[PDB]
Amino acid sequence: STIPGSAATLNTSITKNIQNGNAYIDLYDVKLGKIDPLQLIVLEQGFTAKYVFRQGTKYYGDVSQLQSTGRASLTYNIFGEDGLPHVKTDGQIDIVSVALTIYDSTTLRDKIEEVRTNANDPKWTEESATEVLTGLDTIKTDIDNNPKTQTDIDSKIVEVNELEKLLVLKLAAALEHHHH
Predict the structure, then answer these.
(1) Anything further noted?
(2) Which residues have CB under 8 Å from 16's CB, separation 6+?
(3) How would you classify residue 83: left for phi > 0, otherwise alpha for psi between -120 and 50, otherwise beta?
């Protein structure tokens, strides 16, 4: 929800990055520049905020610096118009910490395009050509709209490998439909 006397509330409407009060970032979106940590929160008039990441043993002031997938923390330091940190009514520095999960789908999305390129080869029967494409599009949609754990991304890489194996050559199909 929102911490007692804070000037910043975490924006839950961005379901792709915010869930159950936790933040999620896909390095793919970071590389394609689709992420801006300051849009994940709502600042009430008269206060500015500067975010800071904390992963391993270092702090990152700019999301682009994030290079590894893992568990980290997103923190938002709130400041008043005087440039100094805001002190909440309870007498504490007004800061907002969000548990962050960093994952990267880059590899998966490529593995998908590979299988997709393969699936569209007219050498494969249209039933498999399509069953595999549906499979890929279902995953694709999911990784675009929903946040995932890196552990979860790798499992979908496996699902894709398996779907690619469903492809069936028209040649084979034609030798089976043969009755001697």
Answers:
(1) Identical repeating units define protective epitopes and may play a role in generating phenotypic and genotypic diversity.
(2) 24, 145, 146, 147
(3) left
